[PDB]
Each structure stands twice: as structure tokens, then as C-alpha cells.
Design an enzyme around this catalytic site. Sequence first.
Site, PDB file in Angstrom:
ATOM      1  N   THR F   1       0.952  -1.337   0.014  1.00 47.54           N
ATOM      2  CA  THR F   1      -0.092   0.061   0.055  1.00 47.54           C
ATOM      3  C   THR F   1       0.860   1.280   0.120  1.00 47.54           C
ATOM      4  OG1 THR F   1      -2.106  -0.825   0.891  1.00 47.54           O
ATOM      5  CG2 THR F   1      -1.454   1.336   1.294  1.00 47.54           C
ATOM      6  N   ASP F  17      -3.041   4.160  -4.138  1.00 50.53           N
ATOM      7  CA  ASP F  17      -2.686   2.719  -4.840  1.00 50.53           C
ATOM      8  C   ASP F  17      -3.948   1.923  -4.662  1.00 50.53           C
ATOM      9  OD1 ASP F  17      -1.943   1.530  -2.484  1.00 50.53           O
ATOM     10  OD2 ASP F  17      -1.158   0.068  -3.722  1.00 50.53           O
ATOM     11  N   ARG F  19      -4.138  -1.386  -4.839  1.00 51.49           N
ATOM     12  CA  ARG F  19      -3.885  -3.068  -4.829  1.00 51.49           C
ATOM     13  C   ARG F  19      -4.057  -3.403  -3.548  1.00 51.49           C
ATOM     14  NH1 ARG F  19       1.796  -5.837  -6.538  1.00 51.49           N
ATOM     15  NH2 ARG F  19       0.913  -5.689  -8.382  1.00 51.49           N
ATOM     16  N   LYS F  33      -9.135   2.691  -1.333  1.00 53.13           N
ATOM     17  CA  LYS F  33      -8.394   3.179  -0.189  1.00 53.13           C
ATOM     18  C   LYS F  33      -8.484   4.692   0.423  1.00 53.13           C
ATOM     19  CE  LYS F  33      -4.771  -0.060  -1.356  1.00 53.13           C
ATOM     20  NZ  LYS F  33      -3.242  -0.246  -1.585  1.00 53.13           N
ATOM     21  N   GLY F  47      -2.407  -0.276   6.621  1.00 58.38           N
ATOM     22  CA  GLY F  47      -2.574  -1.246   7.794  1.00 58.38           C
ATOM     23  C   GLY F  47      -3.664  -2.447   7.537  1.00 58.38           C
ATOM     24  N   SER F 129       3.516   0.658   3.138  1.00 57.08           N
ATOM     25  CA  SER F 129       4.802  -0.076   2.632  1.00 57.08           C
ATOM     26  C   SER F 129       5.449   0.694   1.387  1.00 57.08           C
ATOM     27  CB  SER F 129       4.527  -1.617   2.213  1.00 57.08           C
ATOM     28  OG  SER F 129       3.512  -1.759   1.081  1.00 57.08           O
ATOM     29  N   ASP F 166       7.585  -0.555  -4.809  1.00 56.01           N
ATOM     30  CA  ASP F 166       7.107  -1.476  -3.746  1.00 56.01           C
ATOM     31  C   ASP F 166       6.241  -2.741  -4.122  1.00 56.01           C
ATOM     32  OD1 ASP F 166       6.155  -2.543  -1.062  1.00 56.01           O
ATOM     33  OD2 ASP F 166       4.468  -1.112  -1.186  1.00 56.01           O
ATOM     34  N   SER F 169       2.276  -2.584  -3.405  1.00 57.10           N
ATOM     35  CA  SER F 169       1.621  -1.758  -4.367  1.00 57.10           C
ATOM     36  C   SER F 169       1.646  -1.960  -5.605  1.00 57.10           C
ATOM     37  CB  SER F 169       2.203  -0.317  -3.867  1.00 57.10           C
ATOM     38  OG  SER F 169       2.330  -0.070  -2.658  1.00 57.10           O
TER      39      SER F 169
END
Lengths: 251, 245, 238, 204, 233, 220, 202, 241
Positions: F1, F17, F19, F33, F47, F129, F166, F169
Site C-alpha cells: 500500500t 494505490d 492493490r 483506500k 494497515g 509499505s 514497493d 503496491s
Amino acid sequence: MSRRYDSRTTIFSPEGRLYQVEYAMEAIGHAGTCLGILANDGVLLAAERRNIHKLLDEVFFSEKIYKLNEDMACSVAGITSDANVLTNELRLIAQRYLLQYQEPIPCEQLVTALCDIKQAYTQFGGKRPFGVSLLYIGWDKHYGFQLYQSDPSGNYGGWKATCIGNNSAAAVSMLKQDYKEGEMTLKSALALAIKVLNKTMDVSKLSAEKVEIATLTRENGKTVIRVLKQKEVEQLIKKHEEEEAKAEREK
Amino acid sequence: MSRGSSAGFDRHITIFSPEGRLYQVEYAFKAINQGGLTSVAVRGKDCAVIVTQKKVPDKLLDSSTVTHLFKITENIGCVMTGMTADSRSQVQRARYEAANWKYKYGYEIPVDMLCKRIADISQVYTQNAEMRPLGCCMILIGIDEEQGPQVYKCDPAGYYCGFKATAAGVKQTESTSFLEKKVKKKFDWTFEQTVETAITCLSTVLSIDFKPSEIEVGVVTVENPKFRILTEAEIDAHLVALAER
Amino acid sequence: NQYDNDVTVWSPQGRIHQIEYAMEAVKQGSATVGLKSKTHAVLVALKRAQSELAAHQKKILHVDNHIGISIAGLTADARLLCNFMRQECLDSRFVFDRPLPVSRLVSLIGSKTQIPTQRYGRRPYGVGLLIAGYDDMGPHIFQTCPSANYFDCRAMSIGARSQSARTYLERHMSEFMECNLNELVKHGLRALRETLPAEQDLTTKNVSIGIVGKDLEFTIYDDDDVSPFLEGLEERPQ
Amino acid sequence: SIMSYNGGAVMAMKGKNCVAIAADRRFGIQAQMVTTDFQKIFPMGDRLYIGLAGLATDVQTVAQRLKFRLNLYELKEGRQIKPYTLMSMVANLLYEKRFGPYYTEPVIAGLDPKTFKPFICSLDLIGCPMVTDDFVVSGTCTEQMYGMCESLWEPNMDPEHLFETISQAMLNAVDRDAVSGMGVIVHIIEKDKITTRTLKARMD
Amino acid sequence: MAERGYSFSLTTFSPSGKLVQIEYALAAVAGGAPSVGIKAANGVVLATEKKQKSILYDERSVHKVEPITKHIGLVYSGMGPDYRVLVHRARKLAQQYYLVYQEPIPTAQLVQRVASVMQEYTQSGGVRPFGVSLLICGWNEGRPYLFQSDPSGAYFAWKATAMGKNYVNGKTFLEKRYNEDLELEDAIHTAILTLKESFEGQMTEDNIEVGICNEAGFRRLTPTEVKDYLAAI
Amino acid sequence: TTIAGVVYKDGIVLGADTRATEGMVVADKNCSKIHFISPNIYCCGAGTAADTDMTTQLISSNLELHSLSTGRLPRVVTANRMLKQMLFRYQGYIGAALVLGGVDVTGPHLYSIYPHGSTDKLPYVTMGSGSLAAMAVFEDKFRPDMEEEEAKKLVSEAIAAGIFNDLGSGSNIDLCVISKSKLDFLRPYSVPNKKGTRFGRYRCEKGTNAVLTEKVTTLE
Amino acid sequence: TTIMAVQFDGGVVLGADSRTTTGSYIANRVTDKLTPIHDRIFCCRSGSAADTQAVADAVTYQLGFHSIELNEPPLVHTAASLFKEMCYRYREDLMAGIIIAGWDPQEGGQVYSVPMGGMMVRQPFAIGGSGSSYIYGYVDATYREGMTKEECLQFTANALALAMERDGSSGGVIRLAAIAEPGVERQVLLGDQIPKFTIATL
Amino acid sequence: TGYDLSASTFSPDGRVFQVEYAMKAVENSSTAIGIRCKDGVVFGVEKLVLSKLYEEGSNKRLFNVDRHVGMAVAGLLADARSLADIAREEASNFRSNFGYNIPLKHLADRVAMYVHAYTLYSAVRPFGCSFMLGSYSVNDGAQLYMIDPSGVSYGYWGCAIGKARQAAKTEIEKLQMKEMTCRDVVKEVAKIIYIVHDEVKDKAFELELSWVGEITNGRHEIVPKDVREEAEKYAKESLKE
């Protein structure tokens, strides 16, 4: 303090009576008429509609008839909001039994649980009793089609044909004279209900918008509970009027 | 039912009379007048002013401790009318509610919100039988950034409302009629005009010329939103200006 | 009337009638006298027999090695209060390893018995107590009442016909302080005898004596231990 | 580890005007098979089904408690629940046990009442809902199911193509998982009928 | 101080079978300011009179027509602080429903929950029943709803109704003026006329409060809109 | 994320993002999100996804009650205070990491909220992340009082850095622009990744699957 | 984190770095660690950010209500006592080292240390946080009695700069606050404003 | 007509008669006075000796509720003792929570609110006592507060509670207590107490005296035996003319 303002709802009278229960029964006697008739192929409730006014919006499902689970339904007479409390409790009890046993609750057990709640209000807590009498119709695998009646005192009993509310005593006399045990069909039971409501509702003529009729039957191993349409009640009332006219012509 | 009908315990506990009245709430409204004082609140264009009658019969009484003006927060002031201990309990509750609102929501409570909270708390007394309602009335003043000066009043019935001007206590009917006359002929109310209007309302309904020790004055202004109680010097200056005219 | 049923109802005269009725409960009990010298505190209790074939009811109770009590009024309330006092004394000895000072115990009693005088549906304790104690401040006589008020006394008498005993104690209060133990007990016995009917006299059957002192832990004398104190009593003056 | 104690696999897939939901039929404890007709797909309406994978005890408990709440809902409101509302109800039920969670991951497949628009969703064990437009999977062989569904799924499939696609996905995915299989049951929900089928499957 | 309330009922059955406290709460309602609800074909109008007792009162400070959700509105007749209690409870019940089901509460469901609260106050220990009647409007499934909830806890669905002072005459006027197929503008006119029948003195855009519920949601009418409607009458 | 937010001269830009991975497998390709709090306040979440959804729903409900009661627009500080007190009372067990952005009567405000209940009021924040890649973009290219288009490009760049560096993501970039006069919920704002074009045609034909039993229930 | 407070005749000087880390990652490089508790009372916070923020909010609430009730400006000692009670009662759950500094009409300028564990001590000056270990010798050698407000500001800036150069958990900008009877003066030293100490080479 | 039975019931005039009956209970008790001079507060109580059997200092109506705060009571002594316990609890909790001695105004407000809490309910009874709190400090000065059964708390320069409080207030008015010190106030207090006592109605009484001020280093204590004896002699001399 408490003592001087306490009404003492749950105490005996010098004659051995419970006054608040008797006054709740008076309230029941005021309310609209509900009738229950058991036949060999089903059972029916027929209730007088007391919310009659041209500006009232059409009712969603029924004014006085409440489905309780897949196999049972009830009609109420007395205080309406107390009846809402009680019908919610009944639905909860039926679902609790279903969760516990994964089978539908037998009708008498549901009535007995609700009557235990009513009795508890009659014995302790200092609260006023529920002002509701109930008619229950149902089917179970133990006793087939069943009709029950319960009071604010928590007493209940099973019946072949019964009535609560306004003019219930005259309706019970009609039922005693006219009900034929072990031979009633839903058609003859509906005819008897129409005649009884004609007599009981002496002031107001039977019109399909003044009464609500629900029938409980079995089809293919399922229980079907249906409130009759306005046209069906109109046809029943027309048939009753024809029966009365022909019986007069014979006489 | 019949006018002034009574049945059962409707005169002793907060239950409905046959006419649908709550006699205990009306008796609490009379308890307000039992105090014997009168207060007036007036809203200006940039200020709100509360003026209350101050009576100290005896010299043995430390006058600095005889106040019906309280500050609830830095920016909210109040004048209490009626039973003194009930008034002080309501003041303590209002201060607690304001502090908790600031703590939970991160900004100062608006005056209307505080008045509504106190009114809810007192409606509870109007509906529960085991306790009596408080015999006091609260008038709050403050400055809302969006809407300017605010004068709100809450009563023992749990009813609250915003006012252009208002009064509480013994002569509040005469005070309200005087303020009606003043607000009908609407002219732009500066700070001085608002203070003079409040003081002249109190002096004309009490039928006495005032002295700086006989009244208590608290103000909030747009320039200085903080609630402040005028000293006897400022009150005497205002009284002199009012007397010469 | 409307003001004499609840302990939470003030009368228009500024009185509480239930508290006064509990006072009457104390006044119905049999007499008991408490007095003190420089070194000793003595309780003398006139016991009453319900029938000729019954034992005389216990009036003097142990609280702690330095504290004893005599009771008037409802006996079961007295047992409640005595249990409370014993628990307080044991708490003090457990926490501080010292005997609980008598006046602090009496303050605890007053605090405990005031509470039911203000709460609806409660009642006052219907018991009056004479508390004999010895501590660092010497001997102490205390009187506790259903009103939750308590008094530090030179001497005191409570129960039925206690006014005559109080008059005798008024007369000889000046003598009490320099009396030795036997003389002090005899003064208490004469005061108790002043509350008796003419036919009745002090006997080893209807007299109970509790003594506490500087070197003497609280001790009760009931039937045969009372005789040395009864011996030497002059006949009633009349 | 706990979620894999009994094995099991459930999958839902979206068609043009239809939905499909399929489950393996094995009930077993670790490596030992006990029965081969364990029910994992429960009807929550005329055109609404929920499939549960995870601990068999929590499968049964959650299905029964959801039936409790759904029956109460449909009595209080004289209507059938919508699939989105059912998903929210399931999420609330799962999140009520946030720290003592039920070990099931539900999959919901249905048609909107009065609209018949296909709806599929999945939830994690503490009730985080995920609505997709193609497929959802749950169970002990989600990687294999993802391979099969990502390869084979196409938009706007008619119910027969949908049946073939979900059948091949489930069969080849559970053939590659040790503790799932022993038969596959597929439900195809259209607006006018529901078709239930059992697939010919490996029994090893 | 003792925080224990009374545990016995204050509403009990009379020998004739009536709960007189609920009838007295209804008398309190009947003494309240007139309220009118009219359900049109594409919305509902709730109109109440708020005639202040003095010009010193700030009209904008307090409101009698209240939003419960974005799609449900409330008005009352009776005792105002009881109304505030019920408004707070209705908002909390609507929020709890939204938290469980993630859709706005249907009007009938919210009416049922509010009526349940009112019944609780007709039966529980140490309390009097609420002294208000509620008119509740909502829009659900492309459909308008109008309900009335009484102090007993009984609720009714209405096409048009009136509460408060002169509500019998208001009901007669409504039933001789109301018809189906009515639009929201004509329903607003009819509601204002029903208020005008029992109104005393001149009706201004500040003397009355009007709320409307349609597909766009529930909203209070600004005094300018009300002034436009009054000019049209 | 990867979630991010900036304060620009007229308001807030939030980005995320789309995902959602379960372990190391992509479960949801299009996950939302950015969460509604109030018509002027939004929140991106990272989280534990269930914790984030439940916490934002609860705070949104409480703020709706608050704004109905006060009749006023909600403040970002109120949402921040409610969120941080709730998260602190749970001692980090509710694993919600939040980027809370809004515009109220006091102006634009942006907060980062951590699962243990600490908050930071900052002009730009990143979380998740991919937060360090997005933060690198911000520290390289952020300027105060950016225009709306500049801020949107910057936030999309930060999200793209998270997406392309990342592993947790990916997929689309979602934006939410908040100002005192408008709210633009741009979903998707960018689609930098697409599924590769299919070079073949898997065999999927009627009759391929053998059937043991069949049962057809007709619906009324 | 490095926090510092120094008393001078008519008030106090407080100072902090602005670095908040999560491991080796700097999550906030411009953190404000000087928190007003009341009009003339500040706290410097070190330790868990959630814990110190929660405790400072609670103490602000309690002190404000107490000040309204008493109709009196709060004592610095009262705020320190409230912090001490909270930190001692929850010592097993909190990681919070606090400096409470401010001005009183009754007591003048005051500095109190409430370290982890919940003890409370008044000091002529206090330092705290992870960086404070590196400047113990410097402040011991440098502090002198009778410094003015400007000398105290320079002393605090120098000590904080040295700690920030050595401690990996400290850095960013220096936030300073001078509290006296007239009010609070806050400033930020950043960039070339931060005191510089040449690295020793060769 | 049944309106005077509970503190949770208003009379039709807006009065709570139970609180007034508690006040009547106070009006029947003996007189206590407090006087606030420029450097302290002095309390004097006329303690009636009902029985010669009692000790000296029995049923004392002067209490130490904190090191710096003393209490003079009138009315039901058991109620007064429970209120003194409440005041001690408040002072001790304040020291534990905030770390310094409770200001007298704050202690008076707290205890007055506790008292007012007993005037609202039918489940409890209003206290049948009124009392004065006296304190001195360098920072706050001398302070004298009075609290009645309704819960009203006011600050005073001089105060009297009990049977003869109007005559005592008249005597207090004749004093220039704002410039006096504790030494001469003690004599004035003893004189006022001896004046307001009625020897025919009440036979014998002890004179309880206490003070707090710069003389005692801000500590409330019983007035020492020398000063008390001097004050009693002066009061007895003033009685004779």
C-alpha cells in the site's frame, strides 16, 4: 418517596385477585375483534381493521397480523405498542430455538415462552402488565395445524375456534353453535369467519377494507401464510350476502 | 380536562395532569422568582452584555463573593437567576461540559451547543420522578466567529432559545416589554448603547437609580471575545453617562 | 402523623421523629451505669430476667483487651455494633500493632450510625452504649446514642429509671476520681441500685460488672465474682 | 495452520446476467477424510448464496448465526435482503469477534432482488469486504484457483459458459490441493431458475 | 444524594382498562402548535407553525423541522424538550442502522425504533411518557413515506394528517383538499393552507417552518423559499 | 500500500494505490483506500484493512451525528481528536494507519495518524509499505502553495513511485482533491498498469465438464 | 530526541529538537515537541509519541478545568503534579519523560523533571531524551548561576546543537520558547542559525 | 397539602420545605460566631453543658478539617461530624491530586455542592447543620466562609449561626474587625458570646475558642489557655456595668 407513589401493580387484592391483570383484560375487551378458526386443511385469522380512515396510507403487509417464523403467525388485540414489543420477543424466541436445534420451534413452545414473559411481569418487578391478548396459528410436525390464545395474565389455551377483542363473547356463542369439529374445511371456515364478523361488527357493515384475513396452509411440505387480497374478501362477503338472501327466500 | 384539573400525584411528581401539564415544572419556575432578583441580557452588533441586580443587605457579607455572574470558559459568560445553590451546581455542570467538549472535539464549544446540553440535562429532571428540577435559569453570552454575539437562555423546563435580548427573575415581564419597545425601533447598537440599554431596562423596571455597587455587568465583544466583568469604576462611568442623559 | 414514619422526613419543627423513637427504644432498656476514677473504668449493668426460670440477659460485652461495652435497647442492633467495634479493634491491631484509642473507636461508631439516619428506607440503630476503655489518655467513659451523637463522660447511666442513678452520680462525681477500685465499683453499684424498685435489691443474679484499668485487661464478673463487690454494701438509705 | 485444519475451497464467478458459486465437498480432519458431502454453500435468499471455507465448526456456526440474523431482518423488514446488505451484515458479524475471530472466509454470490444484477464478494476472517467484477476465491488452494480463474475468466459469459469456466477452474485447482476435493458442487443462479450440479471428480 | 430512580411504573391500567397517563400526554400533544404532513406523488411536505411569543426571540436559533438522516425529516407537536430527546435518539438509531447495514435506514424501520423507545417510556420505572407526537417523512426506493408516532408508541402511515391545535378541523380540510397524483409544489401549497386555517394573525416566512423530502433528500426550506410560496398564496 | 497527501494553496490532495494483497498474492486489483469521513473530510487508510474500514466508518458516523447536532461543517481537528483517542485507548491493537485530509472553516488540514494513537500535522505525508518511495518524491519535489494541477501531478508521481518500487503496491492511482468549493473523487486518476494482451485462446467449450447429478429449481 | 529547560530569574527557556523516528526512518523531521499546557506553562516530551501526546492532552484538560474552577492562574507545580500522578499511575504502560517548565506569579520561573517511572523533581535546569546523554558534561561545565534570558537561550541552543550532531535519534531544527510574565516567545533555529561546531580532522 | 415531605417536591410557591425544616433545625442550636480580622479568623462557640456528668470538651463544635482550615458548626452534631469528615476527605484528596493545600474558597465550594446534592432527592434528607470554614495564608489572606443546609456558600467578615444569630450579628457589626488583630478579636468574640447567651433559658455553657492566622503560622488550633482565660475574664467584666 417510592412507597407513597408506588402503584403496587404486582400484589394480590383481598379477594385473591390481580387488579392490573383484570384491567388489562378490560383494555383487551375494548380493542378490535380478532377471530381464529381451525380447519382440517389449514387455519385462519380474521381481524377487524380499526385503523379505518381515508387519509391513512395503505398498510405494508397487514395491520394486525404478524408472521413470526416460517410456520407461525399471530394476531393481537389490546395496546398496539405493547403488541409490537411482544411480537418482537416472539420472533426472537423462535429464532433462538432454530439456532439451538436447527428445527422450527413447535407452536405451543413459542406460546409458552411468551406466556412465561407475561407471567413474570404479573409477579415481580413492579411494572404494569402488557395489555395484549394474542391469537396464534401455526403448523408443526408434532400436532399439525394449531390455534392458540394467550392473555395478559400469561394464561394460554388451544382452541378449535376462538375470538378475542370487541364482542368476543357473542362471537364465541356463534362459534359454539356453528363450528363443526373434525369436518371444517378452509372454505367453510372462511364462510363461518365472514358470518361471525358480520354479527360481531354490528355497527359497521362488512367491507373488504374493514377486515384482514390470513390463512395458513401446507403445500409440498412448505407452510404458506397468505393475507387475502381485497378482491378475495369482497368475493367472500358477496357469497355470504347471497347465502343470507337465499336463506331468507327459503324462509 | 377541566381548567386547572388535578388527578393523583400530578402536583407532587413530574407526571401529566389531565390537561397535560407538569405542575412541578411550573413550581420550579416560581422557585426562580423566590430568589427575588432580576437580570437582563442584551445583544449588540459587536457585543453581548449581561447586567444583574446585586443586593448585599448587610456589611458583614464579603461583597466580592456575592456574584451571579460566572465565566464558563474564557470566552463564555453566564448570569444565573433563582436558587443560589441550584445555580452554582448548574454553573459547575456547564464548566465541566465545556471543558469536556473542548477535550473531545478539539475546539471551544459554541454557546448554542452549551445551552442545548444544559437544557437536555434539565429535561431529564422534567421526565424523571425521583428528583426535583433545578429552580434556576441560565443566560449565556459569547461570541461565535460565524454569527457574532450570542445570547442564549435555558430554563427549568429544558427549553432553550437564542435571544436578541432577554430577562430573568422577578420583573422579567416588564423587562421583556421594555426590551420589545427598544428592539422594535431598531438602531445600530454599539457597545455603549447595548450597556446603557441593559442598565436602563433594569433601572426602569426596578424603579431605582443605580449605584456601581448595586449592579453587576459582564460583557463579550468581537474585539475582545474574552468574558470580562466590569469593575465598579467602569460601571460608574456608564452610570454617569446614563444619568446625564 | 405524616412526619413520624421516615428517617428522611424533617418535621416542620426541625426534628426527626424516627430518631426520637429510637431514643425511646434505648430508654425502654434496663439501667446501666458507667464511671471512672483516675485509673479505672467500671460498667455496672442491672440485668433483667424475662421469666423466673430464665437466665438474666447479657448486658456487658467484650470488645478488646482495653475496651468493653454495656448495652441498652435492641439487643440485635447492639450485637451488630459490637461486631463492628471488634472488627475495628482487630484492624487497628493488625495494621499498627497498637490498641485502637477509645475516642477514635467512638468516632467510628458515630460515623457508622449517622449514615442510616439520612437514607430512605433505613432506620437508626435502636441501641445506646456505655463504652469503658483505657488507653494512653487514661480511663474513658463514652455514651453513644441512636441519634449518632456521642458524649465523653465522667459518669453516665442509661436505660429505664436512669435519672435517679444520674442524680446519685451528680452527687458523688467529686468523690469518684480519687476512689480505689472497690470504692468506685461500690459507687457504681449504689447508682445502679437507685434505679431499682423498692422490693428489688442488688443480688449476685441481677448484677454484672465490667472493669478495665491501667494494668487490668477488661474483665466481666457475673454471678459469683460479683459477691466480693456486693459484700460491704450498706442497706438502702430510704 | 488453523484455517487449513479441515481444508476446503469455495469460488464465486460473475456471468453476464448470472452468478456461479462452487465448493469442494470433503470434510476431513488434517489428513484423514471423514465425509464427502459436507455442505459449504448455504442459501440466504431466492437468488443469494454464501459459501464458507475455513474451520468446519466455524463454517457451521457462522452459517447458523447469519441465518438467525437474516431471518430476523427479513421479518422486521418485509423484504428480501440485498447482496450488499448481506455482505455488510456478514462483515459486522465477523468484526464483532475482532480479537476472538471465527476462522471462516465467506464468499457471497447473488443477484440483486428486483434488479438481478450479479454481485460477488469475499470477506476475510475479521470481515473486510472485497467486491470484484470477475471472481472471488476462498480456502486452502487460493493460488491454484487464482491461476485457473485469471487464465479462464471472460466478461459477459452466458450461464453455460459460466458453468464450464467455474467447473474447470474448481476441478483443476482442487486436483492440485491435498486437503480439498472429493467432489465439487456448482450452483448457477439466473433470474428465473437455479441449477445445482455435482461434478465428476477425483476421489483421492 | 442517591442516583437510584424509581423502579415501579407510573403508567398503570385504570379500572375501565385505560392508561390515563398516555391520554394526558395526548392532551399535551393536542395543546401543541399545529403541524401538517402531506405525502405527494414525488415527495412529502412537513409544515409547522413557530409563532414566537415575542420579537426578542431569535427565530433562526431553534428549529422544529429537523433532519434525522440525509433522507429522513422530523417535526412534532407537543413539548419541545421531549422532542429534542427523541430527535437525538432517532439520529443515533439511524446511525447505528447505517453502521450495521451500510445503507441508510428505511423510514419505516426508523419509525419502528423510535416508537419502541416511546413505548419503553410508557412502561418503564419512574418515568412519564413523552408528551409529543412525531411526524416523520422519508424517501426510500423511489417512494415517499409519511408516518405519525404517538406518545403511546403506536405509529401510523398517513397520506396526509395534522397534529396539535385544531387538528380535527385540519384533518377535515386535508381530506376535502387532498388528492392523489398531487405534486410536491401543490402539496406545499395545501400544507401552508392547512396551517393558515388554524393560524392566528398574519403568517410570514418566519412564523412557519417547512421541510420537504424528495429523491434529492430531506431539507428545511429557507425563509426565502417559504416567502416565495406564501406570495404564491 | 502507498497512500499520500499534500496541502496545496487551495486545499488537500489525497492519493492511494488500489492493490490489496493477501500474503504475497494479489487479492484485489481495484481496492478503494480513500474513505469518506464527511463532505469536506476524507481519509486514506493503510494497515489492517478491516480495522481501517471499521474505524473510518465509526468516526464518519460520529461526525455525522456531531454535525447534525451543531448544524455546522465538521472540522478536521475533531476527526483527528476522535481518531487518536479511539486508537490510543486500544493501545495499537486496532491497526489503522491513516492520512486524514480536509478543508474546514479554518482552512486545509492534513494529519498522519498512527495505530498507537500519535498524530502529526504536516504539509505532506505518506503511509504504507510504499511510503518511503512516495516520501522520496515529496522531499525531492514538494513546494509550498502549489496549484491544484501541480499538486495532483506531484501526488500521482509519489503514488507511482510506491507502485513501481514497493511489491505491496500496484494497479491504479486514485486521487481525491478537496477545496472549500469542491470535492473531486478521481477514481481511477491514472492507469499505469494493464493486463498483458492475450496471445492465445484457452479451450473452454460447452460439454467439456462431466456432470454426475443435476437439479433445476424454477423461480417464480 | 533531546529536550532541555533552564530557569532564569524571571522565567524559563525551553528547547527541543524536531526529529521523530520509527527505527532508522525519520517519520517527522519538523516535530513540535514543546507543548503549551497553559498560557504560561509548557511541557517538553520525550519517549513514545502516542503516550506523551495523550498525557499532555489529559493534563491540559485537567489544568484548564482546575484553573477555571479556582479562578486563578495555575501553578507550574500543579501541572507538574498532574503529570507526575498520570505518569506514576500508568508507569507500566507509558514511556514518557517530561519536562514541565513555566512561570508563576507565586514562584517565578520553574523547571520540573518527570522522568520515566513517575518521580518529580525541581531543578535549576533539566535535560532529557536519548540525546541528553551526550551533553551531560557540556551542561555541567557550562551552566552558571545568574544567566539572563539571552544567555539561557544561547546555552540551550548550543547544548541542543551538540546533542543533535551526536545523537542519531535527534536532528532537524531547534525549537525554543522563552516564558516570562509578559508572555511566551517562540522561535525556530534552522540551517545556518543552528550553532556550528567544526569537526576535528587530521 | 402534602408538599413538605420530600426534597424532590416543589411547593406551589416554588419552595422546598424540607430544606426550610432543616434550616429550622439549625435555628434551634446554640450560637457559633466567626470573625475575620486583618491577619486571621477567630471562631467562638457557646457550647451548652446539658449534663454536669459530661467531661470538658465533650461534643466539641470546632473541628480541624485541614492543617490550615478550621470548622465551626451549628445544628445536628452527627450531621456536622459527617460533614467535617467530608471536608477532611476533600482537603486530603486535593492535596493528593494537585500537590498543595486546598484554597478555602475551593473547599467551601466542594463541600457546599456536596450539601446541595442532598436537597434534590426523596431518597436522602438535607443536612440539619450549618457551618463556617476559616483559614489563613500569606498568599490568600484570611478567609471566612459560611455554608447552610441548602448548600449556599458565602464569604463573610463576620458571621453568626444558631439560636441567637441576629443579636450576635448586631454585636459583630459594632466591630472594626478589618483593622484588628487576632489578639483583641478573641476578646471581642468572647464578649459577644457571653452577651448573646441567655442564663435563664440555658443554665451553663463552656466557651470554645479557636483561631487561625499569622499568630499561629497559618495553622488552625485551639486558642491557648492563657488567652482564653484572659478573654473570659474580659467578657465577664464587660457583662458587669
